[PDB]
Design a protein around this motif. Structure first.
Motif, mmCIF file in Angstrom:
data_model
loop_
_atom_site.group_PDB
_atom_site.id
_atom_site.type_symbol
_atom_site.label_atom_id
_atom_site.label_comp_id
_atom_site.label_asym_id
_atom_site.label_seq_id
_atom_site.Cartn_x
_atom_site.Cartn_y
_atom_site.Cartn_z
ATOM 1 N N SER D 59 38.778 58.041 32.679
ATOM 2 C CA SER D 59 37.402 58.239 33.099
ATOM 3 C C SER D 59 37.156 57.564 34.442
ATOM 4 N N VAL D 60 36.222 58.118 35.197
ATOM 5 C CA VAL D 60 35.639 57.413 36.314
ATOM 6 C C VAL D 60 34.121 57.520 36.194
ATOM 7 N N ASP D 61 33.441 56.393 36.032
ATOM 8 C CA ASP D 61 31.982 56.418 36.008
ATOM 9 C C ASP D 61 31.393 55.998 37.343
ATOM 10 N N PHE D 62 30.605 56.903 37.922
ATOM 11 C CA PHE D 62 29.889 56.647 39.170
ATOM 12 C C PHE D 62 28.528 56.085 38.835
ATOM 13 N N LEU D 63 28.311 54.811 39.181
ATOM 14 C CA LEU D 63 27.118 54.077 38.729
ATOM 15 C C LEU D 63 26.071 53.816 39.833
ATOM 16 N N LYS D 64 26.534 53.574 41.050
ATOM 17 C CA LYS D 64 25.639 53.352 42.180
ATOM 18 C C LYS D 64 26.165 54.109 43.348
ATOM 19 N N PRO D 65 25.259 54.717 44.113
ATOM 20 C CA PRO D 65 25.793 55.478 45.241
ATOM 21 C C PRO D 65 26.453 54.520 46.211
ATOM 22 N N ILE D 66 27.535 54.979 46.818
ATOM 23 C CA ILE D 66 28.270 54.195 47.791
ATOM 24 C C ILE D 66 28.073 54.862 49.142
ATOM 25 N N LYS D 67 27.626 54.093 50.133
ATOM 26 C CA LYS D 67 27.231 54.673 51.413
ATOM 27 C C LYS D 67 28.140 54.295 52.593
ATOM 28 N N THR D 68 28.008 55.006 53.714
ATOM 29 C CA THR D 68 28.812 54.702 54.901
ATOM 30 C C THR D 68 28.536 53.281 55.346
ATOM 31 N N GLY D 69 29.589 52.574 55.743
ATOM 32 C CA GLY D 69 29.469 51.217 56.238
ATOM 33 C C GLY D 69 29.404 50.181 55.128
ATOM 34 N N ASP D 70 29.306 50.648 53.881
ATOM 35 C CA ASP D 70 29.392 49.752 52.727
ATOM 36 C C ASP D 70 30.780 49.112 52.663
ATOM 37 N N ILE D 71 30.816 47.884 52.169
ATOM 38 C CA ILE D 71 32.063 47.190 51.956
ATOM 39 C C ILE D 71 32.405 47.194 50.470
ATOM 40 N N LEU D 72 33.587 47.702 50.150
ATOM 41 C CA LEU D 72 34.042 47.805 48.777
ATOM 42 C C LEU D 72 35.072 46.760 48.440
ATOM 43 N N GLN D 73 35.000 46.258 47.215
ATOM 44 C CA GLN D 73 36.092 45.481 46.666
ATOM 45 C C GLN D 73 36.557 46.146 45.369
ATOM 46 N N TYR D 74 37.818 46.568 45.350
ATOM 47 C CA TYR D 74 38.466 47.124 44.155
ATOM 48 C C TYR D 74 39.272 46.062 43.430
ATOM 49 N N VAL D 75 39.118 45.995 42.119
ATOM 50 C CA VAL D 75 39.915 45.090 41.318
ATOM 51 C C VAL D 75 40.592 45.876 40.206
ATOM 52 N N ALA D 76 41.919 45.789 40.125
ATOM 53 C CA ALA D 76 42.650 46.455 39.047
ATOM 54 C C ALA D 76 43.428 45.459 38.170
ATOM 55 N N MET D 77 43.369 45.706 36.862
ATOM 56 C CA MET D 77 44.040 44.885 35.866
ATOM 57 C C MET D 77 44.586 45.761 34.763
ATOM 58 N N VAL D 78 45.664 45.319 34.124
ATOM 59 C CA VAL D 78 46.123 45.931 32.879
ATOM 60 C C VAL D 78 45.310 45.430 31.671
ATOM 61 N N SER D 79 44.680 46.356 30.952
ATOM 62 C CA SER D 79 43.793 46.017 29.835
ATOM 63 C C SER D 79 44.440 46.312 28.475
ATOM 64 N N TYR D 80 45.565 47.009 28.513
ATOM 65 C CA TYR D 80 46.292 47.344 27.300
ATOM 66 C C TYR D 80 47.736 47.672 27.634
ATOM 67 N N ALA D 81 48.663 47.131 26.857
ATOM 68 C CA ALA D 81 50.076 47.451 27.033
ATOM 69 C C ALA D 81 50.624 47.851 25.684
ATOM 70 N N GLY D 82 50.929 49.130 25.534
ATOM 71 C CA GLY D 82 51.550 49.626 24.320
ATOM 72 C C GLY D 82 53.044 49.478 24.451
ATOM 73 N N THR D 83 53.762 50.442 23.893
ATOM 74 C CA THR D 83 55.206 50.434 23.959
ATOM 75 C C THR D 83 55.692 50.749 25.367
ATOM 76 N N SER D 84 55.362 51.938 25.869
ATOM 77 C CA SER D 84 55.799 52.305 27.222
ATOM 78 C C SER D 84 54.628 52.523 28.165
ATOM 79 N N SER D 85 53.414 52.410 27.634
ATOM 80 C CA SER D 85 52.247 52.858 28.372
ATOM 81 C C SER D 85 51.289 51.708 28.649
ATOM 82 N N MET D 86 50.536 51.846 29.733
ATOM 83 C CA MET D 86 49.534 50.843 30.098
ATOM 84 C C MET D 86 48.168 51.471 30.377
ATOM 85 N N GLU D 87 47.111 50.830 29.896
ATOM 86 C CA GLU D 87 45.816 51.171 30.439
ATOM 87 C C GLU D 87 45.538 50.219 31.624
ATOM 88 N N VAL D 88 45.155 50.782 32.777
ATOM 89 C CA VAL D 88 44.665 49.969 33.896
ATOM 90 C C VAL D 88 43.166 50.208 33.994
#
Lengths: 162, 162, 159, 162, 162, 159
Positions: D59-88
């Motif tokens: 899923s991708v949820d769009f919650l607030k509009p993002i505008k030109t000149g805005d500064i973004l910070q992306y943070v990624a983490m592993v939230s689940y590790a199964g046998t061979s698969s990961m949720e990020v």
């Protein structure tokens, strides 16, 4: 073997964004031409059932200006099939989605040559129209195709001269 | 008022990268056309001393294939100047840089209209050749210009029909 | 007032190259999916639209360099102001004229008036058996959509 | 073998430029999704210590509009590790530097599979949270994961029908 | 008023794509410099708590080649703060993500000026190091800063001459 | 063996557009600088080249939308295997046919054989009054470059 113009018809809807336009809200000619080239090549491959190369862009007529936020529909068809070569016609329509009309903003004709894996010209099927728009492009193709061969020979002189 | 073809001549050196080629190592036609469009518009403005619009791309002939890692030189000149309009000729050369050779890989002719602050057709200076290459394009330009006008007759007949 | 799934159907043909890779990069596919789905949703709503969410992108078959892609976008569900768009991404075999479904995506758009407020949209109805399959399976997807924005609701609250 | 969610955490500050926005100066859902996919893949590689492929964007949820000149910070983490698969999980923040605030603009969950040198599924280390936010994504992951496996059953039913 | 070097530290993990490399699979110097410029401006805005302008890229040293599919980690810090100006240092690392090593592949120094909302120079806080890497760049800044003020004198001589 | 600064001089005209507060992005400018300079260095060396460093980019006048840019690249110094390329970035006023120097850059390339080892390059000589200004001032920039390459390798040592 014959294919209808519809069998290889390709569609492309794209919207006009600020990075796509000039200093007057108006679409870059270069951007329109790249998209034209992209859709026509695929249409040419489908029809030939082989890899193809662009021999020439025979014309692009800019008829109505395209502005930012405009919605485009590109339509590509094979309008003439020689031995190994095809003319592709691309219509670029401005698609009004709030009053559901279409205006022809640019018109382009391209020539592709089909190739086998050798790198040699491959025979292509012939083409036939089924409705009158297709018939219009089909009927007018022969006068365009000879002018294409004439201007490539004056292009032959020019390279020789240089 | 008159300008030489050289006064407004623009140059563009660019190298052909992977992002620009197809999976047969061959340059995207659309990319060549975007660059052609870009260099030709600037040449047209310099010459007109005004903002300009592309009326048409009259032809692009692809004469020699262009591959990844090749060095390109675009040369653009005004080859004909009417009342409000210019034909720009763009030469695209493959530049051999340690044998210092140049091969003509593609040739293109475009048509621009100069516009005033309003957006109406503006008078442009005439143009004149100084060397024999410049004279070649200049001399052959008038036969090309009538074909340009004859063929947009076909485009409105075509628009009318649709 | 109703529109068929075909009325707002949009197409996009694309070939896959290196700037695009020998597995196609997902980011490229996802930009093209979003581009095509938005136009279909505008056509259907006859109004400006915003992406509320990407409900899923399923990568089913790898896409290799030089593959030819066909994207097909349709509205598969229309509620009050919201539309589900389904995008099918096909590997288009053009020398033996086969088609394989390489990726499948579902998105949710909301229509807007000139204000910036939700605009009512016409309904949608299927005409062929593929259109019916997506039309019929849409309702479970749609509340699963609102069910996970309530779970999205808790997440933002918590953070 | 186990890793903390922090060990594979990736950051990305990027500014939003015109090239990234539509004519409402609002960020392309598609561009954002490409960036999410990029930062998630790296985080997934770091955690698994293996090449990975994307099975799905869950899923991708769009919650607030993002505008030109805005500064973004992306943070990624592993939230689940199964046998061979990961949720990020990726959080996309609008980064306000004139008052040092952060607002959550978008939220995405992706699923990657780690691969052998052959290309067959590879076992991954497990994952564990260390703070209350990490534990929140961790405690909520198994429900998203069971939905993921359910949604690929309906993905196959769809393929079968076509 | 003072900030540590860590307060305004920005991170960016990015993978190197075909679009970013040349025909030897090697990253475009221009792309790296664009990415360097992007992350440094943000670090500069953060430190100054105001809009910034780039006065100069003081140097970019290419130390180890960067290839397609390589994973980069960019780190930017303020290494020096004068009255209205900041030096930002950017470290570009090739990140071995399966053995968790890092090699410093390129190093750059940039100079920004903070501006008020009118567009005139704005004062910035001082900067201070906390660890041995941070103190290394801080201690060596005075020579770089004097290298910088000398080179804009020579840049003015050049303009006056031209 | 010698080449004039003109023999390998390269030109590039570009207009400043959206994708490019609209004040030109430094990154776009620097990407273009790097491209034009590498081509001049290959032309001069008659060999493949690598960028060792960007020795400086000075932003002197803001470039705003609708400015027309002219880039000029020249070899301003040639050692045994290395070249300094100077790039001038001009705001080209085309209806008053005047020129303003908006940015100035110096780059250092090293020539390489098919092996991948440093290749000897011809020397360079100026022909006009501008070419002599860059030629005459290069050695002090060039020594300032050789010092900064040590500090950069040492920095690697330290970390």
């Amino acid at each position: 073997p014959m294919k209808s113009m519809s069998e290889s018809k390709c569609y492309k809807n794209r919207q006009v964004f600020p990075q796509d336009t000039n200093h007057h809200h108006t679409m870059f000619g270069g951007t329109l031409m790249a998209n034209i080239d992209e859709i026509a090549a695929i249409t040419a491959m489908k029809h030939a059932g082989a890899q193809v190369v662009a021999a020439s862009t025979d014309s692009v007529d800019f008829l109505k200006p395209i502005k930012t936020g405009d919605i485009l529909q590109y339509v590509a068809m094979v309008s003439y099939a020689g031995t190994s070569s095809m003319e592709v016609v691309v219509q670029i329509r401005i698609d009004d989605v709030f009053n559901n009309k279409h205006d022809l903003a640019a018109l382009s004709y391209l020539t592709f040559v089909a190739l086998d894996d050798e790198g040699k010209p491959k025979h292509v099927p012939g083409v036939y129209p089924e409705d009158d728009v297709e018939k219009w492009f089909y009927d007018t193709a022969p006068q365009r195709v000879e002018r294409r061969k004439a201007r490539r020979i004056e292009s032959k002189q020019t390279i020789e001269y240089l």
